[PDB]
Ligand SMILES: Nc1ncnc2c1ncn2[C@@H]1O[C@H](COP(=O)(O)OP(=O)(O)OC[C@H]2O[C@H](O)[C@H](O)[C@@H]2O)[C@@H](O)[C@H]1O
């Protein structure tokens with residue numbers, strides 16, 4: 001399948017996944033394409049922060065679905 | 077009560093433990109005298125404010141003006157331990173329990189007072205400011221636990237809408253939460269109590285996973301270094317900035333209301349109760365965000381004077397923290413004699 | 423002159439503070455007679471309920487570690503005070519022991535009953551596994567207590583039993599005695615009757631031990647008589663005991679033997695240690711204190727050193743502490759605590775109970 005992760009810029013990352021890919025898994029792909037450290041990553045779907053220990057099948061996250069990415073910021 | 081002199085032995089006595097142990101000693105010896113009603117009434121508020129230095133001074137002065145009514149070794153031992161007292165954010169257990177209890181009382185007081193109509197009125201400030209990824213809140217709030225589910229979701233506004241406010245702050249950059257991912261450890265203790273810390277049996281909670289946050293000590297002027305009295309749970313709260321965004325929209329939409337200070341106070345106070353209860357933060361990890369001047373301005377220019385949870389009486393929790401401190405320090409002396417008895421079986 | 427009473431699943435150990443051993447050890451049993459008529463001329467405690475259990479109907483109120491019937495608990499307690507210790511409890515402050523993971527409502531009935539029913543001057547409640555650690559002179563480490571009806575893995579940090587890591591296995595001496603009964607009836611000896619239970623429990627506490635490698639001991643029992651021992655029944659017959667000797671305690675490490683999908687005491691200790699902060703685990707791994715009669719098997723501490731090392735990291739320092747006195751470890755830790763002078767300020771007093779009620783125990787004994 002497929003999904004689109006949108007940023008707070010509105011740019012659209014397209015990550016091909018298989019529905020048993022964990023949230024831990026998708027953040028890693030995201031880092032590989034974009035370099036973002038997986039630990040600043042917060043992915044939202046249906047208004048809920050996705051826990052990286054579950055899967056896309058567990059969130060009913062499906063093909064052509066959009067996720068939201070919000071990067072954590074701890075500089076102080 | 078010789079017990080007080082055995083509690084004062086503990087190497088780990090902190091400033092909080094002192095105030096609690098000294099005040100309990102004084103209130104037994106000279107007790108019920110309503111002449112002295114004042115002195116303890118005012119120390120109880122001083123402890124709450126976390127103004128330990130002042131209280132310590134008062135406490136020793138009490139034994140200065142009232143030495144005749146008190147035991148000499150105790151008065152002199154307290155005087156001796158006092159100069160060396162310190163507070164450590166990693167370990168502030170008496171205060172951890174105290175605040176965890178205080179926010180039960182602060183939840184009762186919000187419950188007696190509020191009809192939850194401000195939490196229904198604050199729905200449309202939330203839905204106004206939320207990011208698009210945040211879920212529109214459509215329900216009616218009829219109980220304090222829905223206002224509590226609602227209130228806490230402001231965290232969704234984090235990392236995005238709260239940033240313009242977050243940047244104005246001199247305090248927040250002195251935050252010291254280690255970037256280490258430590259995960260979650262199991263706990264049966266409530267609030268800002270630590271998982272492995274002792275507790276009363278009436279005071280346990282259903283076992284759950286709790287997050288482990290490390291202090292970053294390499295931070296210059298770091299908050300746990302500036303205000304050591306405050307227990308470390310997660311350093312300075314930045315979700316305060318998000319409630320600040322939601323609240324600012326409320327003050328605008330409700331500026332003509334005459335009950336607005338009461339209502340904004342209810343919201344602010346429930347937040348405090350809630351962060352403490354959930355273990356997210358200590359009181360001064362929230363209040364110390366709010367009281368920075370630039371944010372005080374929002375309230376002041378609208379004539380909102382916030383009480384920041386200061387209640388009329390903190391007694392029941394003061395006295396309960398006193399029992400805890402007592403029983404832990406006598407257990408430390410209990411442990412000390414014990415190991416020094418087992419050193420002699422060789 | 424303080425009193426100490428270990429309220430255990432199988433039997434109670436009772437005695438006085440300062441003594442190296444409990445003065446009274448007797449079954450946790452109350453016979454209530456199966457018919458009236460043996461009451462002409464009205465319950466039974468401990469050993470005497472054991473002898474007359476044909477006429478009586480036996481309840482174990484502490485079965486599994488937590489007091490179940492209080493009407494029967496009072497009896498066991500009255501029996502302990504006036505008969506076994508031959509003491510007026512209104513004379514002696516009473517330190518009492520409780521199981522790990524005891525419900526808060528139970529600790530209040532113990533307190534309430536001690537003050538209201540027996541009118542004691544003072545009293546304290548203490549966790550059985552915490553006192554065992556104390557008899558070994560530690561404040562931090564993980565206790566493995568195996569008794570009659572219950573096994574508990576209890577991590578203790580600085581005096582505090584960690585409720586979020588306390589693990590319970592209902593497998594202990596009673597089950598090992600039943601399983602031995604079964605093993606020996608497969609070999610042709612006949613053990614069924616409760617007296618035949620009572621004899622089998624003798625063979626357990628003498629002849630049984632723990633293999634270090636179960637396979638090699640098996641292979642040695644099939645290769646020679648070296649491990650066989652004989653035993654003289656009451657009635658004069660001498661029966662021979664083979665690999666039954668170590669297959670009995672093996673049910674602790676391998677509970678499948680009795681048909682239970684549980685984890686073995688080693689895995690339970692590992693799992694209990696894993697439910698604590700990573701930060702305190704070296705300390706639990708370095709202080710695993712064995713306690714209770716079901717740990718008394720020869721060679722239990724080495725096997726556990728073998729198994730926890732196989733489970734823990736390669737770098738972990740692993741110490742099993744198995745003190746020769748660990749049978750009464752709970753009670754002895756009881757007696758030490760009761761005799762400390764510091765502990766003279768830790769008692770809950772009668773004045774206090776009246777001022778508060780049974781809820782004083784939550785703020786006093788914790
Ligand atoms: N996966 C999550 N799911 C739901 N809520 C979360 C999650 N993670 C954090 N929170 C919520 O965070 C609130 C407690 O805040 P606190 O962690 O004490 O420190 P702060 O206030 O300065 O920042 C919060 C950040 O923690 C992380 O960095 C997040 O990214 C946040 O940006 C609670 O309401 C939680 O429900």
Ligand SMILES: Nc1ncnc2c1ncn2[C@@H]1O[C@H](COP(=O)(O)OP(=O)(O)NP(=O)(O)O)[C@@H](O)[C@H]1O
Pocket residue numbers: 428429430431432433434550567568569570571572595596623626627628713714715716717718719749752
């Ligand atoms: N040398 C021994 N070897 C093997 N098992 C023994 C030995 N001595 C006693 N036992 C068994 O140990 C079991 C537990 O006795 P005990 O330790 O008093 O447990 P408990 O009464 O349930 N409470 P606790 O004191 O907390 O362990 C008894 O059932 C015995 O059958």
